[PDB]
Every structure is written in structure tokens, then in C-alpha cells.
């Protein structure tokens, strides 16, 4: 009833097949994230990765920021999130320029210069879009509260 | 808590209505049996059964609910 | 929909999730599943 085998039946690779690293749920979940999902073009997986992080980065400066005790509470959070997504996409494109210069194959469409460039473009679009949509929900928070409770219905 | 004071007068509340579709008329109509939220009146008779088998406080029902969560687990 | 009871924000977040996220996610996963291979 052993639950920790070696990774993929290979006992000399440096990995164990633990219930977290190599379970069925982990295979179906980690293997279906945009970074690992099958058949996607790099632009759509970069777009889906980007929105999940733009929507995330709005919060930390919105609730904990130099502007959190003023009337421009959400604008400061949005400005910080755009700064972070800008430097994130600059880092992503610099990584693409650096890593993928020697010619490699096309076994994975993401680990190539065109693929990583598409991933960086999608990450930028998704990140700034997610940041602005979280800003738009937060700025119009009275509206969202009223429509979820039924103050206008 | 309120129903076991006078079970003849107060209607037993099942749970709370929360849907975003309710207009002002429906919210004021479904506010009943001494509540602030819109509520559903319980017709399953679980209030009478809990009152008869000796349950007389919300903490007793909460302990029963957590115990049945553990039993289902 | 005011909530007089304890944790009134909890239905505020759980009615959209059980109404949309649970159906959209469950039908999405089942649509990928019943049509796989």
C-alpha cells in the first residue's frame, strides 16, 4: 500500500512520487494550469496567467498602501499594480530574449522564442486587464454591493 | 430562541432568503415571523421535534450540526 | 437582503459561488470530461 514511489517509474531521477507531487488530483490540476495545459497557443495561456495575477496585485496596495487612508485609495493600488505588471512583463520579455537565442526544437510551443514572446504579450494584456478590472470592481464597489444584495432590483 | 417562548404564536423560520432578484415588495412581504431579513417559514416541523427532544438553545443545535458533520466525515 | 444573523457577508459571497462558480466550474469540468478522448 505504498504511496511514495519513484517519479514516473524511474528510481534514479531526483524526485519522489508523493501524494502531493505526483497524485491524480495534482496531475489533473497542475497539468491543466495554463502553463501546462495541452494544445493551447502561448498567447491564450499567457493571457489566462496574466489575468490571475493582475486581479491579485490590486489588493495589497489597495488595503495596505500609502494611499489607503485617503480618497484615492483604489487609484494608488491600481498604479502600484501597473508598475508591478510593467516590470513583470519587462522581466518576462528579457527572459525570452536571453534564454531562447540558441535554436531549440518545438516539443513544447512555450519553450521557444516565438512561444515565449507570445506568452509575454498575453501576460501583459491579461495582467493589465485584470488589474484594471479589479480596480473597476473596487472603485465601483457600492454598485457591486447593491446589485448583489438587490438595492436596484 | 424566540420560538420556544411561545410556539403557538411565532412561525418557525427555516432559513434566510438571499437572492438578488427580489424587489422592494418581495423583501417587505417575505419579512415575517419576527425577522429583519426575508425568511422562509419552516413547514418541516423540525422545530417541534427539536423542542420535544430537549433542545432549547442555538448552541445545542450548533453542537448537533458540528457533531453530524463529524459523523458524516 | 440585509442580514441580521451572524456572518451576513457569507451568503453575499456564497450565493454567487454556488449559483455561478459551482455550476460554471462543474459543467466546464464535466464538459471536458464527457468529451475527452
Amino acid at each position: 500500500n505504498q504511496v511514495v514511489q519513484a517519479y514516473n517509474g524511474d528510481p534514479f531521477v531526483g524526485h519522489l512520487s508523493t501524494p502531493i507531487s505526483d497524485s491524480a488530483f495534482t496531475r489533473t490540476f497542475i497539468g491543466n494550469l495554463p502553463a501546462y495545459r495541452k494544445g493551447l497557443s502561448p498567447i491564450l495561456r499567457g493571457l489566462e496567467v496574466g489575468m490571475a495575477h493582475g486581479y491579485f496585485l490590486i489588493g495589497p496596495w489597495t488595503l495596505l498602501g500609502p494611499l489607503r487612508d485617503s480618497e484615492y485609495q483604489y487609484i494608488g493600488g491600481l498604479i502600484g499594480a501597473l508598475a508591478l505588471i510593467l516590470v513583470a512583463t519587462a522581466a518576462l520579455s528579457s527572459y525570452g530574449l536571453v534564454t531562447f537565442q540558441g535554436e531549440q526544437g518545438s516539443g513544447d510551443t512555450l519553450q521557444t522564442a516565438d512561444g515565449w514572446s507570445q506568452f509575454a504579450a498575453g501576460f501583459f494584456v491579461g495582467g493589465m486587464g485584470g488589474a484594471f478590472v479589479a480596480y473597476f470592481l473596487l472603485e465601483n464597489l457600492s454598485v457591486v454591493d447593491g446589485i448583489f444584495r438587490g438595492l436596484f432590483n | 430562541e424566540q420560538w420556544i417562548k411561545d410556539p403557538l404564536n411565532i412561525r418557525p423560520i427555516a432559513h434566510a432568503i438571499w437572492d438578488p432578484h427580489f424587489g422592494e415588495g418581495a423583501v417587505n412581504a417575505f419579512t415575517q415571523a419576527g425577522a429583519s431579513n426575508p425568511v422562509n417559514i419552516a413547514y418541516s416541523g423540525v422545530y417541534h421535534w427539536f423542542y420535544t427532544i430537549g433542545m432549547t438553545t442555538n448552541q445545542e443545535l450548533y453542537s448537533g450540526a458540528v457533531f453530524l458533520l463529524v459523523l458524516a466525515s | 437582503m440585509d442580514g441580521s444573523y451572524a456572518a451576513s457577508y457569507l451568503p453575499w459571497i456564497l450565493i454567487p459561488m454556488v449559483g455561478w462558480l459551482f455550476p460554471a466550474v462543474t459543467m466546464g469540468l464535466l464538459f471536458i470530461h464527457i468529451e475527452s478522448e
Binding site: - | Y62, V70, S73 | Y5, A6, A7
Partner: peptide, 30 residues
């Protein structure tokens, strides 16, 4: 009445039947 944190305590307790129900249903699927 009932407390605010008792409801969240009930939710995090009921997270355990969620995990065990998921694993039982997965094991029935075999």
C-alpha cells in the same frame, strides 16, 4: 444568537467532509 466565528468554524470543519467525500467518490470511481 450565534457568533460570527462559529459559522466560519463550522465552514472550516465542514471542509473535512468535503475532502473525505471527494476522496471517497474518487475511490468509488475506480
Amino acid at each position: 444568537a450565534l457568533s460570527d466565528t462559529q459559522i466560519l468554524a463550522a465552514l472550516v470543519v465542514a471542509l473535512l467532509p468535503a475532502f473525505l467525500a471527494f476522496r471517497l467518490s474518487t475511490e468509488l470511481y475506480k
